[PDB]
């Protein structure tokens, strides 16, 4: 069981390294891409609203 304890400590160290150094940047990249997709969707909605308003104005004109 000694080697089992050793590899358990090694895995704990690996997990600590991942959470401290790797998780923040990867989570940041995922958040950035999610925000970009949401911004693209909002841009599509705003463009549709712009078209609707422009068409309404043209009909008024």
């Amino acid at each position: 069981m000694s080697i089992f304890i050793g590899q358990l400590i090694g895995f704990a160290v690996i997990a600590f390294i991942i959470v401290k150094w790797v998780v923040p940047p990867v989570r940041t990249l995922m958040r950035n891409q999610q925000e970009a997709v949401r911004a693209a969707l909002a841009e599509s909605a705003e463009a549709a609203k712009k078209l609707a308003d422009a068409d309404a104005m043209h009909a008024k004109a």
């Binding site: 590899q7 995922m30 969707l41």
Partner: protein
């Protein structure tokens, strides 16, 4: 007492033996991959904000599609896109699930792994490499005709080097398999070797090697997928 080899829960059927350890490892990898795939299929939204699983899967798809488009038109050979993608994830999981703390002592002072990466078993790499070999050779046959394709590969890019070209094709499958196998087989020894160290010292070299093993497994999965795509492109050019 390194105890190299010694496949566990081996079983014989139809006169052929099977390493049950590799079968179990491959089954676990397949279960994980299928779970991820169905989680994506049941929670993929084209309109709303994408989820993490969808983001990862579409990143993989974009990478492989861009590689194909760069090498051989994605329109010409669509069936490469799924295959390569699959391969990638497969290899990746087979090289990352090993990180889990599943090493103990088999009541004899020798390391024993509950789960071992199937790539450490020659059968896994041979199966994948041979399947890819048949796949792109058959694709080339379909593209350039049954008689034309062997002629084209034998001729190569220059006629008078026809012999070497043959060797090259013979090296395509083997090079695909052994490399991958080694990249994992070495690990199977490394960790096992470190098991001989005292427990109070085993953690540090074990941690360093396992981190580098994560990185190497990622690299090898990417290389295998990319080389499969490249060989497909080379086999599907007139």
């Amino acid at each position: 007492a390194i105890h190299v080899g010694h496949h566990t829960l081996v079983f014989e059927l139809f006169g052929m033996t099977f390493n049950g350890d590799t079968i179990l490892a491959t089954a676990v990898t397949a279960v994980i991959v299928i779970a991820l795939a169905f989680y994506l299929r049941a929670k993929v939204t084209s309109t709303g904000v994408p989820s993490g699983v969808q983001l990862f899967w579409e990143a993989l798809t974009i990478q492989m599609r861009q590689q194909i488009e760069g090498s051989i038109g994605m329109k010409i050979a669509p069936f490469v896109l799924p295959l390569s993608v699959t391969i990638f994830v497969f290899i990746l999981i087979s090289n990352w699930l090993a990180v889990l703390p599943l090493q103990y002592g088999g009541a004899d002072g020798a390391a024993a792994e509950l789960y071992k990466a199937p790539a450490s078993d020659i059968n896994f790499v041979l199966a994948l490499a041979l399947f890819v070999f048949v796949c792109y050779h058959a694709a080339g046959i379909w593209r350039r005709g049954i008689v034309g394709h062997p002629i084209k590969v034998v001729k190569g890019h220059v006629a008078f080097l026809a012999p070497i070209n043959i060797v090259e094709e013979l090296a395509k499958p083997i090079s695909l398999a052994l490399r991958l196998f080694g990249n994992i087989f070495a690990g199977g020894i490394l960790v096992a070797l470190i098991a001989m160290f005292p427990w109070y010292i085993q953690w540090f070299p074990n941690a360093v090697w396992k981190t580098f093993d994560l990185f190497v497994g990622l690299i090898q999965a990417f290389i295998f997928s990319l080389l499969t795509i490249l060989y497909f492109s080379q086999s599907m050019e007139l």
